[PDB]
Amino acid sequence: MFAGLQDLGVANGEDLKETLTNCTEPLKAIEQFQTENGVLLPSLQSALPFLDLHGTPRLEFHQSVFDELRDKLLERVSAIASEGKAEERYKKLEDLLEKSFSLVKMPSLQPVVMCV
Amino acid sequence: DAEVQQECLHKFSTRDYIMEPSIFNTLKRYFQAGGSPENVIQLLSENYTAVAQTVNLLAEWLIQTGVEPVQVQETVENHLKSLLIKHFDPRKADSIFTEEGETPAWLEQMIAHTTWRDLFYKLAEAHPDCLMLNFTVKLISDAGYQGEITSVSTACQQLEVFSRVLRTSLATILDGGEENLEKNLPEFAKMVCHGEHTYLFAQAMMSVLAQEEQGGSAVRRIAQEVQRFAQEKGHDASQITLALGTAASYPRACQALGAMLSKGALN
Amino acid sequence: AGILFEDIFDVKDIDPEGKKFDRVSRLHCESESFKMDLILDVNIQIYPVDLGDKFRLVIASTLYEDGTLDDGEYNPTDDRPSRADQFEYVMYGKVYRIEGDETSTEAATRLSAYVSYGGLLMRLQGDANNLHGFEVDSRVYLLMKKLAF
Amino acid sequence: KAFEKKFRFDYTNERALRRTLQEDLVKDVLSNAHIQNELEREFERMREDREVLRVIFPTGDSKVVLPCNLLRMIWNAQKIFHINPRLPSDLHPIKVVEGVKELSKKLVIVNGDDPLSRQAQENATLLFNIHLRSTLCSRRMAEEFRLSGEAFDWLLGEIESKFNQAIAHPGEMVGALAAQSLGEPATQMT
Amino acid sequence: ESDTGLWLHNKLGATDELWAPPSIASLLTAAVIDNIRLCFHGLSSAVKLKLLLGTLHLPRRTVDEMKGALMEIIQLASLDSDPWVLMVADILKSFPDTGSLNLELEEQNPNVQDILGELREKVGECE
Amino acid sequence: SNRPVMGIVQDTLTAVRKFTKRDVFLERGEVMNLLMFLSTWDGKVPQPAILKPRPLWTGKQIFSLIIPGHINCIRTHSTHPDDEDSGPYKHISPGDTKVVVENGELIMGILCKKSLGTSAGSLVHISYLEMGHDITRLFYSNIQ
Amino acid sequence: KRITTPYMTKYERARVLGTRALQIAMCAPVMVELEGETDPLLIAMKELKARKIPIIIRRYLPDGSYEDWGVDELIISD
Amino acid sequence: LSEKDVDPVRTTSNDIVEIFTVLGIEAVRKALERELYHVISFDGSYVN
């Protein structure tokens, strides 16, 4: 379902499959592959245990971050529609569409492209 | 090994389970099952929704607008702090610290940040019996950021903390001057007169310095202002002041002065 | 029994604002064990009190030891046993207000029960642990007795 | 800030709700989103009425003259049913909302369904409806008055009964009353 | 008296106020402290601190008449685990003798030495 | 002016102010003599405010029998200090001001024209609004 | 389709009681069972309480139209 | 009213005929009501 992440150089599900097929010990491949693919926040590494100590999956954590940032992107694109000089804001919108249209079909990042 | 495969597929079937750092072990158990990884591959290609890519996109997009990244960074950190304060389990945190065998680096990563430091302080407040929380507080003290632990008027009941904060406030007053007389002096007085023990230490130290006149008139002035503020609050601090001075060497006159100053009238 | 509250008080002060009324005196009395303040109005003329006096104060829901919960109309011709036999000053009134250090979330640690004996007011202010027999709009006896110790 | 913190009725803090309401009701007011939508709508209506009052009443003089003395009748309700404003009550806030709304329909001054008639009826009892909403708030009923369900139903009936007796009696000679009531104090001014 | 420990803790255990509770002198006499001395190891730190601070407010005649039990209470306060009680006992030990505060805070109180030194430096700097 | 036009006047008003003071006490004989004059009395002698060493009633206790129904009213006395409501003792008045009537029973306060006169929200006005007109007529007669 | 108030104005009550008392004073049959009262005002008041007064009030609207209300139809204040 | 730095909104004139000629019949009605209220409540009394 990663139609468009191939343009950004993002490793996709096919890459996960081929790494799992050409894997020797699962810990190495899975850990390295999804930790380089994970959110590179320096302080995030300490937050991971505390989320799952109660058994609450970290998927809820990542989805909460996703939803909050989706609210933020909607607000910011509305601000772009409102603030900024006509020429600079139009050029920004054009460039941002050019570099964000790769994920237009995805309902996850659909509001980005749709508002732009 | 069919049930292990079923458990792995149940765990993976939830969307966004790929970002789980735990998945390793679970998926490793799947490699222990010896089954075809086609189900796992298809499910994982169906669960990921580009959360990390969303965060990177959001960062670049917010930088483009013109709003500084400080606001979004602090908003994200506040959300993370809410999540950590709400979903903190002492038992598994202690178990991880015991099983790892060594002090983690990630604890040191959140030691060197103010927001995470306040997170740790509020956790230790909420979870006093959490031993790894106490270890984290110890490491924060080790790192040299002991100022951020409760101080000023909040935690002036401790010996070293009160003495240090009183010394700093006295230095602040003396760096203040005549212009700062109206502003900082009540701020100092409300934290030195919070108790009779802190006030006793303050007045004893004022009397000790007052034996020296090389600018000690400033310390005497500060002590007199503290005395009058304490009287405004309701202290019977005149007996304290007589305990400070040489006047107590004449018990009759000292007792008479205490009488007039507790009464407040010229008998 | 019907004993809502019982303790020993000693009168720390008499009316500090001046004698507002001739026959009634204000008493600021303070406790010994439970450490709760008391503000009371007493008929000084028939029951004189002086500074430093100590007395036993027993607030009771009823005068009868079996707690029959009398209706509350004056029937002097009653031969039943009563508490008023071993007390000197007895007034009957009702509680009309309970304050507290309540917060929006946490419960209350300090209560202050206000009772009116037909005009003569009494505020019993203490920790909430001992003030639980007081429910607003309930009849209450004072049952005060001076101590010789 | 004071108006918000005194009339909003937050449903997020859980300690306060169990302090004020029974446990059978806190889960209802915490779980259902329809209840929270109703409560937010009620507060927004209250804020709009606040602005309307501020444009009707400059200089901030809050001494008004109105038919039913709501606070005294609330006190009467508290004393009749022995409310004991110390234990959590059993009064679902949506009962308060619906009761106020259905009371507002019964106090009719202008009778009719015509849009002109409806506008006249709404304008006639605007001030009293504003006062009624500002007094019988879900939060004020939940933290200040603690009235139970039966007391609240009795109070609604009491307001309806008392208002209908304040209506001007047809055939009243209001002109003579006004003339006398203006002349009489005229004899006693210097 | 009859379980004077509870009496002291409940008269004077207002832990919310670190100040001197009112009429602290009137709650103490020769016999009161004479009974406190043998039961000084059961009461809390707050009650102990209030007692120690109120021992200052006692009248000079009362302090001098029964000064031995005051010395005993101060000594027992110096052996206390709480550093504040140690400091207060060090300050208080000079009352029965002369009346002025003990200026010798230098012993077993390096924090006092640090604060004195840096205050002295700042005072000399801003004369 | 939506206020009463009939009130308590002259020496009846003077004596009701002197009669509800804190230190007014009545023995059983005078209490019975007064209760002989209540038309609305139900025949039950109230429990005295003081039972020992002598059964003594209080002026407020007798007045509460006059007050009709279950009437709730709060006023202030003519000489009520302003600063009292700020400090402590707000609900226990040192000067016995702050007239309070609960359940038709006079809890505290001294009655003056501010509460028994012809003023908006006075005691007789509350009685007329809550009870009928007949009950208020009886209230007037009993007070007098 | 009557639009005037369903309650009884004080003036309607006064005139209705007066008229019914006058009728009873002239040997008109009583619509309620008497318990031993002889004053026509009291009998009329008792009838009005029982809502057995055989009178309908004709209310005149300003426009010239009128509408008729039976006493029992409309609410009695007292 | 036409003078500069003079509020043309709050400025009244205590005179009912002048207000009638300048502002109209509703303005004179409101001003007359306010004047009657001022002359009656001046003693401190109250008329509904």
Numbering used by the authors:
A (entry chain V): 1 to 116
B (entry chain W): 40 to 306
C (entry chain H): 2 to 150
D (entry chain A): 914 to 1103
E (entry chain U): 6 to 132
F (entry chain A): 530 to 673
G (entry chain F): 50 to 127
H (entry chain A): 1347 to 1394
Question: Which text from the study accompanies this structure?
Answer:
The metazoan transcription elongation complex (EC) of RNA polymerase II (RNAPII) generally stalls between the transcription start site and the first (+1) nucleosome. NELF is a large, metazoan-specific protein complex consisting of four subunits, NELF-A, NELF-B, NELF-C/D, and NELF-E. It binds both RNAPII and the nascent RNA transcript emerging from RNAPII and inhibits transcription. DSIF, a conserved heterodimer complex of Suppressor of Ty 4 (SPT4) and SPT5, is required for NELF recruitment and RNAPII pausing and also serves as a processivity factor upon the pause release by NELF dissociation. In the present study, we determined the cryo-EM structures of mammalian ECs containing RNAPII, NELF, DSIF, and/or TFIIS stalled on a nucleosomal DNA.
To gain structural insights into RNAPII stalling, we performed cryo-EM analyses of the EC species stalled during transcription on the nucleosomal DNA template in the presence of NELF and DSIF, but without TFIIS. The major classes contained RNAPII with its catalytic site translocated either 1 or 3 bp downstream from the initial position, and we built models for the 3-bp translocated complexes (AEC1-nuc and AEC2-nuc). In AEC1-nuc (mode 1), NELF binds RNAPII in a manner similar to the previously reported PEC structure. In mode 1, the NELF-AC lobe blocks the RNAPII secondary channel, which is the TFIIS binding site. In the arrested EC structures (AEC1-nuc and AEC2-nuc) formed in the absence of TFIIS, RNAPII is arrested before reaching the nucleosome, although NELF is close to and interacts with the nucleosome. In AEC1-nuc and AEC2-nuc (left and middle), RNAPII is backtracked with the RNA 3′ end extruding into the RNAPII secondary channel. In AEC1-nuc and AEC2-nuc, the RNAPII active site stalls ~25-bp upstream of the nucleosome entry point. However, the NELF-BE lobe forms the downstream edge of the EC, and the interactions/conflicts between NELF and the nucleosome could cause backtracking. In mode 2 (AEC2-nuc), the NELF-AC lobe, which blocks the RNAPII secondary channel in mode 1 (AEC1-nuc), is repositioned to allow TFIIS to access the secondary channel.
